[PDB]
Swiss-Prot record:
The lineage of its organism: Bacteria, Pseudomonadati, Pseudomonadota, Gammaproteobacteria, Pseudomonadales. Its main location: periplasm. It comes from Pseudomonas aeruginosa. It catalyses: a beta-lactam + H2O = a substituted beta-amino acid. GO terms for molecular function: beta-lactamase activity; zinc ion binding. It is found in: Periplasm. Its EC number is 3.5.2.6. This is Metallo-beta-lactamase type 2. Monomer. A beta-lactam binds at D78, K158, N164. Its cofactor is Zn(2+). Keywords: Antibiotic resistance, Hydrolase, Metal-binding, Periplasm, Signal, Zinc.
Length: 217
């Protein structure tokens, strides 16, 4: 499959895209972000693999950035696959307590730093991690960049079909989606794991898709 792709969205914000064959989904296209604060870089989700995580880190290190931290939006390997490699490279990995518990229960390597707060500032006034409640998974988080008004919704934002329901909470997802819309109505751009980038209406599309999925279940 192709190497990880890196594309600039705007000043200090990049999209990383990685490709992996996942049993029952074929080749999955996965987006995350890299956020720059001066010469510091933060990875919003890891690629699926150590290989792609290393390519991503190398691209930024080669351009004079230090990787100061990573946040995984949920426990699935499309957000966490690179944690083990990042830990081995002394790059601080972060996950919620819930995510780390789910990683431990699935026999996976944990993030080294964890937090329990609903709202966690990875970087004061620059990178907010927010737990809207269960949806795609029990632990799913979003990341908000207040300067750019960019929301990374990870695998919670599902404007055109919910995807993998294996670990999903269909009962909670509509409530969690309304919490997200209430928190980030000012979003200019919503980047998702698997969908086209869009405006704040993608949070309303997600709420509609969660309602539809619950009703059908
Ligand atoms: Zn997932
Ligand atoms: Zn996913």
């Amino acid at each position: 499959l192709p190497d990880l792709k890196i594309e600039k969205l705007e000043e200090g914000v990049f999209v990383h895209t990685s490709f992996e064959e996942v049993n029952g989904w074929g080749v999955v296209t996965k987006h995350g972000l890299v956020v720059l604060v001066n010469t510091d870089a933060y990875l919003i989700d890891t690629p699926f693999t150590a290989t792609d995580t290393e390519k991503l880190v190398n691209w930024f290190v080669e351009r004079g950035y230090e990787i100061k931290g990573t946040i995984s939006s949920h426990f699935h390997s499309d957000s966490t696959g690179g944690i083990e490699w990042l830990n081995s490279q002394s790059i601080p990995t972060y996950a919620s307590e819930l995510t780390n518990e789910l990683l431990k229960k699935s026999g996976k390597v944990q993030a080294k730093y964890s937090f329990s707060e609903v709202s966690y500032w990875l970087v004061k006034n620059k990178i907010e991690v927010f737990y809207p409640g269960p949806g795609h998974t029990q632990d799913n988080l979003v990341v908000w960049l207040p300067e750019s008004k960019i929301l990374f919704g990870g695998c919670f934002i599902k404007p055109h079909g919910l995807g993998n329901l294996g670990d999903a909470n269909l009962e909670a997802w509509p409530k969690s989606a309304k919490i997200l819309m209430s928190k980030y109505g000012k979003a200019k751009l919503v980047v998702s794991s698997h969908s086209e980038k869009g405006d704040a209406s993608l949070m309303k599309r997600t709420w509609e898709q969660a309602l539809k999925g619950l009703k059908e279940s």
